[PDB]
Design a protein around this ligand. Sequence first.
Ligand SMILES: C/C=C(\C)CC/C=C(\C)CCC=C(C)C
Ligand SMILES: [Mg+2]
Ligand SMILES: [Mg+2]
Length: 536
Amino acid sequence: IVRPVADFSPSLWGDQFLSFSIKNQVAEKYAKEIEALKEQTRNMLLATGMKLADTLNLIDTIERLGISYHFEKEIDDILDQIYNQNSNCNDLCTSALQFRLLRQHGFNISPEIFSKFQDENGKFKESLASDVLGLLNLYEASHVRTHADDILEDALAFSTIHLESAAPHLKSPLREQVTHALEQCLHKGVPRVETRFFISSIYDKEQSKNNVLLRFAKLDFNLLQMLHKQELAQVSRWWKDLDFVTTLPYARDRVVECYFEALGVYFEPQYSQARVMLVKTISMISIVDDTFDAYGTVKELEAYTDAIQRWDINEIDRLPDYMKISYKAILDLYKDYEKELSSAGRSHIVCHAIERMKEVVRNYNVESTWFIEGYTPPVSEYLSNALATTTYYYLATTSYLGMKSATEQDFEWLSKNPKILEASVIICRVIDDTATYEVEKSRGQIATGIECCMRDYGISTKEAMAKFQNMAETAWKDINEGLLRPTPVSTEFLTPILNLARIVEVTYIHNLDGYTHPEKVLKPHIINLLVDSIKI
Ligand SMILES: C/C=C(\C)CC/C=C(\C)CCC=C(C)C
Ligand SMILES: [Mg+2]
Ligand SMILES: [Mg+2]
């Protein structure tokens, strides 16, 4: 049997992550000062008689500095109270910020706060075009719209045109903040990435900066980075022992990239265990994808699918040699999962993640069949299979495994394919097909998402690409709507789904597969998040 040619580039990273020894003295020094700075920060938030604009600017700063995970109660109480006071404020800057912070935290504040800034048609008064800060905040707020927010239909285009016009003459670092926002808005960015940029390129360079807050953010970012470095070391050891880089040389070698993805789903230390489990699944399912996609044969892929469906060690002998590697590693990864959760009595929940992995594999197989036959389904039929081949129902289920508070009713909710999860899956799927379109019409892909769409509707490649853009916009409005209270589960179980959508946007920025081709988009992030500390 003849297999296809290996074209995946090797891991950029070698072994620079394989061993990290925490300087335990440094850590304890950071932690001790952090405790002091934490209380100073708290007392800032609990301070009385602050004006509205100063309270929102404080919370916004703490959030961009990446330290708001320390003050979830205090921030919640202050925004709640702001929500219920429905105060009037005649300042675009403060109104737009009030809107974004409330919406991001689930409070369904009314978009009518923006009507006083519009003319008749509900178009923004162009007299506002010289209010750079107001424009900046309207621009960030315009990314948290729901379907009930068509007052804001114009805010993105209006704020964008005038930020571009103003940017070249703005002072620093405001200029760099605006330029960055136009390339990457806050709401759809990965939080650690946005936080590293804010600390280093913006706040550190602010004439007005608060020194307590800056030192806090620098120390906290560097202290957490040490934890992530440990995790990546241990995950890097795990990957090494499996040695798929030699035994399965057809597969992408990307455990570091998988770690970055999992660090986007959550970065806080309380999710250390969840983070490590999640990375391992991403790795493994990336292997199964390379097998179906650029190596295995029709007959082989079917025995793989059946074996996965059956999910029993007895089945290895039914599969060719190399597939036995994949198969046993998968089954043992899940025995390990069951062991990690024993102590706490949560071993049973592994089966949810398993059922979603079986589903992924089935749909890989269907997609193979469609390719071998040259079948070009209608869009509806394409999606009923290709949504799950994003792995996003699978990764979202996985993300809960390590979260100690995840209950069985939380997994029940996720199994019913709730609206927020589906939106996140749709974003992943259409970003994929827009990016990997051409590159797969080269390898003779006949059932690419875009193709199905053109043939189904009778429309050119462009119009089809714009139709996928619309499903993504619809999907982001659905995610934003899914964060509004009352939430169907704790917000703690909603954020991973939202972060899954962020991860996809950040990895395919500028329409290029950054996981397979990490050097251009993911490499600078991995360096800023996992190599270089923030110079204090
Ligand atoms: C956008 C396309 C994909 C995501 C492919 C399916 C996912 C993987 C093969 C895991 C690595 C990439 C992540 C963004 C988690
Ligand atoms: Mg694939
Ligand atoms: Mg494929």
